[PDB]
């Protein structure tokens, strides 16, 4: 992901 | 223990100790012991006579007269077979094991004998449920007050069954604690789906008990459980009977457990108080 978690 | 058990483990243990050495020849092992359990009822195990090949178990039910008047012919053949004989001790049901005949089963018989008190108690409740199930004209309501000064009443009409509990607390210390305990009994319902309605009443006795000479007074609460076939059928009958019979001792034991819990909490807080005090001593 972009915010929260990686991906 | 959280749900108080119904199987008295004393009989289980003694019968296990007796039978584990049963196949050891002419081993009488004369036994004579007196016990006691909830509801203020006394047990007694003792050989009938000098012949030690037979062991007898008896009960001293307080409300035995009501059971005899009702008639428990169902209980004489369904759970207990041919090993039941007329009362000897005090005109109360007493059974015996015939050791000369081979005992085939070991655990089933012990378990059956373990629930003697509830096995005899069910003779009235199961029969009332049968009356309302069979379509027979609603059998006359009955009141069954056991050893405790409190009273129990049941009404078996069509489309449903009813039960009401009367509560009496002896020591002044536990009266308020029990009142608080039972106050939240009538409301806790957010974790039960197929459960009966629950209500509490102490000032105004229910209109059902006005004519009946049940527990009537001032410092006596009332609890009623509404019964429906969805939780009183042939499948969920034993569980409900066990829960209701073990209701009183359940309340008692959990009251004591709460007392111990609060004792532990205050003991924990004493440490914090001492830590706060320790600020006065020098480095």
């Amino acid at each position: 992901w972009x915010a929260x978690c990686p991906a | 223990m959280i749900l108080l058990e119904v199987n008295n483990r004393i009989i289980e243990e003694t019968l296990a100790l007796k039978f584990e050495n049963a196949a050891a020849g002419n081993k009488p092992e004369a036994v004579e012991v007196t016990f006691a359990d909830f509801d203020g009822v006394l047990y007694h195990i003792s050989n009938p006579n000098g012949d030690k090949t037979k062991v007898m178990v008896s009960i001293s039910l307080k409300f035995y007269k009501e059971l005899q008047a009702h008639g428990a012919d169902e209980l004489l053949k369904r759970v207990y077979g041919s090993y039941l004989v007329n009362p000897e001790s005090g005109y109360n049901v007493s059974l015996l094991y015939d050791l000369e005949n081979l005992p085939a089963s070991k655990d089933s018989i012990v378990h059956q004998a373990g629930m003697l008190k509830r096995n005899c108690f069910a003779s009235v409740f199961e029969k009332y449920f049968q009356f309302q199930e069979e379509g027979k004209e609603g059998e006359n309501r009955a009141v069954i007050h056991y050893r405790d000064d409190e009273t129990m009443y049941v009404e078996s009409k069509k489309d449903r069954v009813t039960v009401v509990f009367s509560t009496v607390f002896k020591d002044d210390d536990d009266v308020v604690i029990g009142k608080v305990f039972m106050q939240e009994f009538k409301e806790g319902r957010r974790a039960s789906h197929t459960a009966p309605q629950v209500l509490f009443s102490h000032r105004e006795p229910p209109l059902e008990l006005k004519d009946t000479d049940a527990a009537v007074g001032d410092n006596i609460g009332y609890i009623t459980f509404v019964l429906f076939p969805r939780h009183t059928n042939a499948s969920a009958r034993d569980n409900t009977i066990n829960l209701i019979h073990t209701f009183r001792d359940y309340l008692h034991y959990h009251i004591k457990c709460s007392k111990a819990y609060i004792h532990t909490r205050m003991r924990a807080k004493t440490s914090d108080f001492l830590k706060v005090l320790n600020r006065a001593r020098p480095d």
């Binding site: 992901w1 972009x2 915010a3 929260x4 978690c5 | 608080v180 106050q183 409301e187 957010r190 000032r203 914090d272």
Partner: protein, 372 residues
């Protein structure tokens, strides 16, 4: 015995203070958090349970749970803990010294009221108390006797038509939609943008984001078209970690759920439709007065432009031959508390309280007959 305390158990926040003051003395959210990890260090045996601004500060290692859900209490232990905290740690006033005033949403189960009254009378042994409605206190705060209340709180939105000296209990509509559903929808859409938020800490973060960077749109289609030309509407927010999040259409999308409940899948109508139905169910003559006066209150109605959109929608639905006016005081957040304080200060209300003697002799059912 000189004053009384008014406590508003808001679905998402708690307001408390003395009777007479114009502003509350205690404003903290209703959070009852517990540790989620094991704990290793030995020099701290601290507070297995957490409540209040403390819970907000250290929310990163706690499983925050709201004791009240959509206006109905679910966990009584949490509510009693928050009551004890507010009474002792913050207010530092013993319950016996002064009475307490409580408020609740309309059309609530009687079980909640009976349990609350029993707990208040038994645990804290308050000398007296009372139960009221937030909307009537909103009227008292607004200094008006006729109108319609839009009490869109964090947990429940409801309306209660009123007339001079009397109310209309048969025209009360309660909608479960409230700020929590808006926050959930905002999280769902923020996921579609590319930003993920699941746990309760990010729930608080998104709540703050909505509180700071959300507004209503006069026209949905025009705003969407202008968003197609996304060069003047996007705004940036700074997260605690320093990451920057750009929010575009989501600013005016989530509030529209109030007027379009179909977005969440609820088969109901918007606030405008419900208010129109409630006013129509009233008598013809009082319709004019209700139209001329429309009081709104709650923390979910602070979005700029909401009043204009509501006015436009009501005028479009209502006949175009009279005048419809929307009144939006800039202090609607604490209107309920102000109304409760004013009501307590009233001399005539000094006798309407419920005392321990009458409660004990009668029973918990007394509160049911006390002003419905």
């Amino acid at each position: 015995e000189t004053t009384a305390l008014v406590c508003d158990n808001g679905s998402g926040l708690v307001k408390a203070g003395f009777a007479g003051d114009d502003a509350p003395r205690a404003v903290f959210p209703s959070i009852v958090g517990r540790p989620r990890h094991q704990g290793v260090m030995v020099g701290m045996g601290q507070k297995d349970s957490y409540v209040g601004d403390e819970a907000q500060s250290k929310r990163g290692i706690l499983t925050l749970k709201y004791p009240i859900e959509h206006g109905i209490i679910t966990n009584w232990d949490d509510m009693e803990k928050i009551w004890h905290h507010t009474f002792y740690n913050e207010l530092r006033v013993a319950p016996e010294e002064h009475p307490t005033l409580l408020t609740e949403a309309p059309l609530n189960p009687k079980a909640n009221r009976e349990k609350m009254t029993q707990i208040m009378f038994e645990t804290f042994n308050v000398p007296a108390m009372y139960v009221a409605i937030q909307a009537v206190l909103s009227l008292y705060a607004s200094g008006r006797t006729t109108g319609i209340v839009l009490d869109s709180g964090d947990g429940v939105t409801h309306n209660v038509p009123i007339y001079e000296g009397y109310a209309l209990p048969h025209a009360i509509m309660r909608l479960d939609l409230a700020g929590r559903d808006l926050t959930d929808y905002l999280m769902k859409i923020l996921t579609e943008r590319g930003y993920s938020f699941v746990t309760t800490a990010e729930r608080e973060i998104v709540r703050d984001i909505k509180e700071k960077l959300c507004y209503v749109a006069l026209d949905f289609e025009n705003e969407m078209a202008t968003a197609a030309s996304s060069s003047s509407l996007e705004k940036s927010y700074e997260l605690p970690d320093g990451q920057v999040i750009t929010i575009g259409n989501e600013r005016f999308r989530c509030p529209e759920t109030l007027f379009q409940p179909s977005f969440i899948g609820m088969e109901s109508a918007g606030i405008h439709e419900t208010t129109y139905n409630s006013i129509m169910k009233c008598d013809i003559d009082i319709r004019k007065d209700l139209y001329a006066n429309n009081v709104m209150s709650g923390g979910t109605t602070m979005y700029p432009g909401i009043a204009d959109r509501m006015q436009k929608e009501i005028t479009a639905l209502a006949p175009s031959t009279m005048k419809i006016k929307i009144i939006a005081p800039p202090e609607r957040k604490y209107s309920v508390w102000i109304g409760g304080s004013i009501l307590a200060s009233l001399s005539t209300f000094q006798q309407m309280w419920i005392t321990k003697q009458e409660y004990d002799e009668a029973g918990p059912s007394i509160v049911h007959r006390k002003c419905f």
